[PDB]
Design a protein around this ligand. Structure first.
Ligand SMILES: CCCCCCCCCCCCCCCCCC(=O)OC[C@H](COP(=O)([O-])OCC[N+](C)(C)C)OC(=O)CCCCCCCCCCCCCCCCC
Ligand SMILES: CCCCCCCCCCCCCCCCCC(=O)OC[C@H](COP(=O)([O-])OCC[N+](C)(C)C)OC(=O)CCCCCCCCCCCCCCCCC
Ligand SMILES: CCCCCCCCCCCCCCCCCC(=O)OC[C@H](COP(=O)(O)OCCN)OC(=O)CCCCCCCCCCCCCCCCC
Ligand SMILES: CCCCCCCCCCCCCCCCCC(=O)OC[C@H](COP(=O)(O)OCCN)OC(=O)CCCCCCCCCCCCCCCCC
Ligand SMILES: CCCCCCCCCCCCCCCCCC(=O)OC[C@H](COP(=O)(O)OCCN)OC(=O)CCCCCCCCCCCCCCCCC
Ligand SMILES: CCCCCCCCCC[C@@H](O)[C@H]1CC[C@H]([C@H]2CC[C@H]([C@H](O)CCCCCCCCCCCC[C@H]3C[C@H](C)OC3=O)O2)O1
Ligand code: SF4
Lengths: 68, 156, 115, 105, 51, 80, 171, 318, 98
């Protein structure tokens, strides 16, 4: 009957959730538990480049607080 | 373990994909093709067996020669049969295509498509019932189920 | 470099599949098979002969309408301009000008196909 | 121009973006804005056959700022000498020219 | 000032409308053959086309 | 002309909506009360640093501290 | 990495050289798209995003009509490719070898200036403004609607008039 | 760590499209009182695998009259473009961020047509040529309209990047203000991918198959690899551009779960339409989009040019 | 910047050398004009982006608006050329000899 279409869609629907959920989680794994910063203007790139050189480890996803 | 055993399973794998995706060709000549439509009709759906009709011979595995094959058409049928990429199968359908059928003694009928293309399965009748052709298609599927093409390759 | 990897990953994937398409299966070639298809019968003439179209007038005006959008896609950044009034007039005129050209093409049977 | 209609009517149809220092869309100074601003001020009233020699010191600066022919020839010379010293094993580059330094904020 | 180079030149027509050899229409021919699914069976329309 | 307007409406509606909205977009900006606010909002955005100006003792109307009441204000934007 | 724009420009030249040899228009369009696609890239390499995708969004639409037109008027029983004529292939390899000979020979005679083989990649950006917004390329194009409106009317008129020009020719 | 991310965007898409082939045959069949494939697996779940295997084990040919270079490069572009075109797609975080995201779509989506043109022309066949010379009419009909619609839709979003559309629809679907466009966008998108009723390049009745009558099993699949991943995409874009799902930054997983619900529902709709209407004639497609949609679309372009002006609703940049 | 413009200028020259030395087709010549403008468009684009001249950015757009209109007129002409000779060839445009 018509509900026999669900197997075609059920594991198809899973296959269209992986590309979305995976990217969000992969970003958080690589970027130290924070979202992937997005540079759409030169102002933001200067800020990431700043954080890349602020931190001793040359990575912009480690954030130094008020401890300097 | 023996290397022969792995070969057969691959042989059964390639055969299986060729059994459940048997695409015929929209090549109904006459008066059996009406019952070749009924095979495609709701009652005896061919999409159940992964059997889908495609117009181009380049994308057709089996050719259902359904209907009387005449002299004027004989050169065309062989040409179309040649275009189908191998492996290809032919399923002669009905009396007019198996032998000459009702027009065996006419001056412009080739007495059976077996004279022009090599036939794999013959489906008798006039017209064969939609089940009779479906039994032919299934009996063609069981033919691919026993090919032994990769098994002999190990023996060559 | 992230975007270079993706297309070259796709290119490799597409090449590998098509490469496996041509060397995996068993082939048996002869002249009758590789000839043009043309619905069972041998073609009377090649398919390279001049094949006249009849929508060439719409084909040309498609270019002018394609350049026409190139003058409209800057609108989202043009709205940010301090003026907001010169932009709007020069936006209506461009769209209105396209319409009048389309309207004249309409009445002259430009969009209709040569019989 | 051939017909001073734009000046006659006073309307600047297409004579406000002639050159780099010509009131960019937002207040973003075009590269070498100061240099060509200097050159255009020098050659005013003084016209054509008198600005090709009196304002030559400033045009050359504008020519250098835009094309940057001299900096490339200069920095090409530094690089060539740097490689020649390396081949003779007489120069060892400093830590901050090799990729290891104390980066500033 | 005729010479061997310009022996074959002719004056232009008075209305500037040359009588060009009327080209023969080379209309494409398509074997709308029997195997076509739109033939309702076996039927060959060898039909002249112009596009 | 009532028949022609509605006869076209009955037979070729698409060419009447296009002409109607075409005239509607031309006339709406003149009547709206917020049309003049499109320009001011695009004057508020400070994309470039507001360059300060020296004091000679004759610059009273510009503020001294950023948060002082003698300069331009955006209090109309918060309540638009 | 430094020799990234140079390789694109060289492919642009090779693609254009292939278009200069004038094969059948089908392949000329394919070569032109290769050059146009490369044209977008080198423009992107220079910090400009909007213009790059415009050369690649307008010439793409153009080649459909050229492809449509060439199959209608300019065709032969056997179209000419780059390898159909050995002379064309001869001037194709010669042209490819020609640039290398010109690119190399210019280097030795002139150390730097027009071409800088020894110093490459260093001379590509010229002092971006590190901190700043509204700098993204494409805002300048949007000036066509403000303090550059003369370019807008003249360009708009050509499209306006062109529709009339085309109809009369094809009447 | 990046290479792994491609797999989570490349393999699932291939699996999803393959299982769309079954879902098409099943949904179409049920609208026609047929049971689609239910013999290969428990419910045909193995049917797409069966079709995939045979085509890559069925001889592909090198026809005498064809052109090998274009005959082989055309399918590669179709799959390369159809797969690389999922890349800037936010779900809700795209694999790469593009400042001009949709323009990437237009150029690449318009670049997919050259697959049909070169495929038809390279395969020196009359029917293949007919398919090629219908994609030109297919594209000349919709490209002028599809670009203007997207301009109008985004003009209340401000930028061109896709991921700003999520922020745009934080509180309301962009369908509601622009449901006129969403209808024109739903047809112009149906023109691309050559999905019925605008199924003319791969015409199966007027032409035997259409730009495919010379592609044997191997390269033939490469076109279906692309012809259906492009169906899921323009449904993916439409649900991102018009049916904006919930973002909820702290819950990225909720966007994808809601996204898939609409993308499948829209995808079931292209297959649903194929099961209901007959096919256009490619002149009527040209007239339909140039006598009806182009007038109204241009008129609506003016309407949305003034909408932020007489409402003070100019969207921001950045 | 310096290395790439030598390649762009010679790209124009090769396209210039192509639109002069004709061949046996007239579509090909129009395609050569496309490459010439393609070289010209990118040079203006790079120079504007190189010098950060955002006021000169509108110019490269206008070249495309007019160069592509030359193609539109050029293609329309070629329709009339073929409808009177049916071959598109260039050596059929020798009827003005006298
Ligand atoms: C995830 C879905 C996509 C999957 C795509 C990848 C598919 C991978 C398929 C794996 C199975 C590999 C075996 C395929 C065999 C196809 C070739 C064939 O059967 O022809 C018989 C061939 C040739 O048979 P033959 O040598 O006897 O042919 C004789 C020729 N005449 C008639 C002239 C005498 O057998 C083989 O040798 C194929 C072995 C391939 C082994 C690869 C491992
Ligand atoms: C690309 C831009 C153009 C650059 C100049 C051409 C460089 C190749 C010269 C070699 C000769 C090619 C030729 O003559 O045409 C033959 C071919 C056509 O061959 P064919 O149609 O005559 O048939 C070949 C049949 N066999 C193989 C049996 C001989 O056309 C081409 O080479 C151009 C097609 C585009 C090539 C693009 C390659 C990109 C590869 C990315 C991976
Ligand atoms: C058989 C061979 C066939 C080859 C077929 C090739 C298929 C091409 C696929 C279609 C690509 C067309 C679109 C062009 C790429 C998109 C350009 C773009 O806009 O984004 C480029 C991206 C930077 O973009 P941007 O948003 O401006 O950066 C902001 C940073 N926050 O980042 C970049 O700048 C990099 C873009 C690189 C594009 C790929 C180039 C490959 C060259 C191969 C030759
Ligand atoms: C407040 C002031 C501002 C107000 C501004 C707004 C004004 C009101 C606007 C109302 C109109 C909305 C937009 C209308 C778009 C449709 C245009 C149209 O009329 O359709 C064109 C065509 C007409 O039919 P035709 O036979 O050509 O008529 C003339 C014959 N000589 O008909 C067709 O195209 C039919 C062929 C296409 C069929 C495709 C099948 C579609 C199946 C239904 C799926 C719909 C799904 C929509 C949801 C998608 C979600 C993403
Ligand atoms: C300067 C010396 C020119 C010497 C002419 C030699 C003949 C020639 O190759 O050019 C003629 C050619 C015209 O083409 P065509 O009439 O078809 O020639 C017959 C081909 N079988 O002309 C052409 O096709 C254009 C050739 C363009 C070559 C560009 C490559 C330049 C780099 C070397
Ligand atoms: C990437 C992974 C691999 C991808 C694999 C690709 C798989 C392909 C997918 C195709 C699939 O997705 C479905 C969807 C719907 C589509 C097809 C199926 C069937 C249907 C066909 O169109 C034909 C229906 C007609 C059936 C009757 C045939 C006999 C007619 C014989 C002619 C003569 C008759 C006379 C005589 C009488 C007088 O009157 C006549 O005229 O739509 O394919
Ligand atoms: S065998 Fe019978 S049903 Fe079949 S074509 Fe002949 S007469 Fe008709």
């Amino acid at each position: 009957m018509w509900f026999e279409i669900l197997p075609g869609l059920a594991i198809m629907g899973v296959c269209l959730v992986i590309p979305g959920v995976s990217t969000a989680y992969i970003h958080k794994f690589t970027n130290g538990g924070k979202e992937k910063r997005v540079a759409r203007v030169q102002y933001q790139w200067y800020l990431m480049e700043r954080d890349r050189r602020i931190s001793g480890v040359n990575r912009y996803y480690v954030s130094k607080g008020l401890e300097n | 373990s023996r290397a022969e055993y792995v070969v057969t399973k691959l042989d059964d794998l390639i055969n299986w994909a060729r059994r459940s995706s048997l695409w015929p060709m929209t090549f109904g000549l006459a008066c059996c093709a009406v019952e070749m439509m009924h095979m495609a009709a709701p009652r005896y759906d061919m999409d159940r067996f992964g059997v889908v009709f495609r117009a181009s011979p380049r994308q057709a595995d089996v050719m259902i020669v359904a209907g009387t094959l005449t002299n004027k058409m004989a050169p065309a049928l062989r040409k179309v049969y040649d275009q189908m990429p191998e492996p290809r199968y032919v399923v002669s359908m009905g009396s007019c295509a198996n032998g000459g059928g009702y027009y065996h003694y006419s001056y412009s009928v080739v007495r059976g498509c077996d004279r022009i293309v090599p036939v794999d399965i013959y489906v008798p009748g006039c017209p064969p019932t939609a089940e009779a052709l479906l039994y032919g298609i299934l009996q063609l599927q069981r033919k691919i189920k026993r090919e032994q093409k990769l098994k002999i390759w190990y023996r060559r | 470099m992230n975007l270079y990897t993706v297309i070259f990953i796709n290119i490799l994937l597409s090449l590998t599949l098509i490469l496996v398409a041509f060397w995996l299966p068993q082939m048996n070639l002869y002249s009758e098979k590789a000839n043009p298809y043309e619905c069972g019968f041998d073609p009377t003439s090649s398919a390279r002969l001049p094949f006249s179209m009849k929508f060439f007038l719409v084909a040309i005006t498609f270019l002018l309408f394609d350049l026409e959008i190139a003058l409209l896609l800057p609108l989202p950044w043009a709205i940010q301009t301090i003026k907001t009034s010169t932009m709007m007039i020069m936006a209506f005129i461009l769209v209105t000008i396209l319409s009048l050209g389309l309207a004249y093409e309409w009445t002259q049977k430009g969009l209709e196909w040569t019989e | 121009p051939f017909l001073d209609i734009q000046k006659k009517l006073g309307i600047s149809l297409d004579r406000h973006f002639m050159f780099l220092s010509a009131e960019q869309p937002y207040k973003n100074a075009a590269r070498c804005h100061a240099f060509e601003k200097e050159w255009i001020e020098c050659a005013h009233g003084i016209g054509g056959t008198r600005a090709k020699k009196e304002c030559k010191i400033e045009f050359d600066d504008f020519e250098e700022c835009l094309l940057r022919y001299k900096t490339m020839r200069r920095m090409h010379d530094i690089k060539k000498q740097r490689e020649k010293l390396m081949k003779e094993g007489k120069y060892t580059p400093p830590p901050h020219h090799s990729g290891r330094e104390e980066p500033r904020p | 000032y005729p010479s061997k180079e310009t022996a074959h030149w002719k004056p232009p027509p008075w209305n500037d409308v040359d009588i060009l050899k009327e080209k023969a229409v080379t209309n494409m021919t398509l074997n709308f053959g029997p195997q076509h699914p739109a033939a309702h069976g076996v039927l060959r329309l060898v039909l002249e086309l112009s596009g | 002309i009532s028949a022609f307007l509605k006869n076209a409406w009955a037979k070729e509606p698409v060419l009447v909506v296009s002409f109607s909205v075409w005239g509607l977009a031309i006339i709406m900006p003149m009547i709206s009360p917020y049309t003049k606010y499109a320009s001011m909002i695009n004057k508020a955005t400070p994309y470039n640093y507001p360059v300060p100006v020296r004091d000679d003792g004759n610059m009273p109307d510009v503020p001294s501290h950023p948060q002082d009441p003698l300069g331009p204000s955006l209090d109309w934007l918060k309540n638009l | 990495m430094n020799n990234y724009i140079f390789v694109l420009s060289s492919l642009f030249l090779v693609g254009c050289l292939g278009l200069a040899l004038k094969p059948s228009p089908i392949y000329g369009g394919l070569g032109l798209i290769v050059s146009g696609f490369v044209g977008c890239l080198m423009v992107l390499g220079f910090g400009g995003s909007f213009l790059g995708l415009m050369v690649f969004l307008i010439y793409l639409g153009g080649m459909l009509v050229v492809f449509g037109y060439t199959t209608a008027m300019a065709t032969e029983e056997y179209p000419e490719t780059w390898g159909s004529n050995w002379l064309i292939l001869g001037f194709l390899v010669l042209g490819v070898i020609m640039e290398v000979f010109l690119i190399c020979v210019l280097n030795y005679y002139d150390e730097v200036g027009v071409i800088n083989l020894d110093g490459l990649g260093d001379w590509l950006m010229y002092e971006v403004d590190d901190v700043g917004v509204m700098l993204e390329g494409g805002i300048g194009v949007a000036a066509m609607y403000s303090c550059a409106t003369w370019m807008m009317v003249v360009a708009g008129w050509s499209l306006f008039a062109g529709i009339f020009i085309i109809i009369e020719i094809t009447r | 760590m990046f290479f792994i991310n491609i797999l989570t965007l490349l393999v699932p898409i291939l699996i999803a499209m393959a299982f769309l082939t079954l879902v098409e045959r099943k949904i179409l069949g049920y609208m026609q009182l047929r049971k689609g494939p239910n013999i290969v697996g428990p419910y045909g779940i193995l049917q797409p695998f069966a079709d995939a295997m045979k085509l890559f084990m069925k001889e592909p040919m090198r026809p005498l009259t064809t052109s090998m270079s274009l005959f082989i490069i055309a399918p590669t572009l179709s799959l390369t473009l159809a797969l690389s075109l999922w890349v800037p797609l936010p779900m809700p975080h795209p694999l790469i961020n593009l400042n001009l995201g949709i323009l990437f779509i237009l150029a690449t989506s318009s670049l997919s047509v050259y697959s049909i043109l070169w495929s038809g022309w390279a395969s020196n066949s009359k029917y293949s040529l007919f398919g090629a010379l219908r994609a030109v009419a297919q594209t000349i009909s919709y490209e002028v309209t599809m670009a203007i619609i997207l301009l109008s839709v985004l003009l209340m979003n401000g930028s061109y990047s896709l991921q700003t559309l999520i922020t745009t629809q934080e509180h309301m679907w962009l369908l509601l203000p622009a449901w006129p466009m969403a209808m024109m966008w739903f047809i112009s998108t149906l023109a691309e991918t050559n999905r019925a009723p605008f199924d003319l390049t791969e015409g199966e009745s007027e032409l035997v198959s259409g730009f495919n009558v010379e592609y044997a099993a191997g390269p033939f699949a490469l076109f279906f690899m692309a012809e259906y991943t492009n169906i899921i995409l323009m449904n993916a874009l439409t649900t991102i551009i018009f049916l904006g799902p919930l973002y909820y930054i702290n819950l990225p997983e909720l966007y994808s779960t809601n996204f898939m619900m609409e993308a499948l529902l829209l995808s079931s709709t292209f297959l649903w339409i194929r099961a209901s209407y007959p096919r256009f004639r490619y002149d009527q497609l040209m007239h339909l989009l140039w006598k009806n949609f182009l007038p109204l679309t241009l008129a609506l372009c003016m309407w949305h040019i003034s909408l932020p002006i007489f409402t003070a609703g100019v969207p921001p940049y950045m | 910047m310096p290395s790439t413009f030598f390649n762009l200028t010679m790209a124009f020259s090769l396209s210039l050398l192509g639109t002069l030395m004709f061949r046996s087709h007239l579509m090909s010549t129009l395609l050569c004009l496309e490459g010439m403008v393609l070289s010209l468009f990118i040079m203006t684009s790079v120079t504007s982006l190189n010098s950060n001249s955002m006021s000169s950015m509108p110019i490269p757009i206008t070249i495309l608006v007019f160069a592509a209109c030359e193609a539109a007129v050029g293609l329309a002409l070629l329709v009339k050329v073929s409808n009177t000779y049916g071959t598109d060839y260039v050596q059929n445009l020798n009827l003005l000899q006298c």
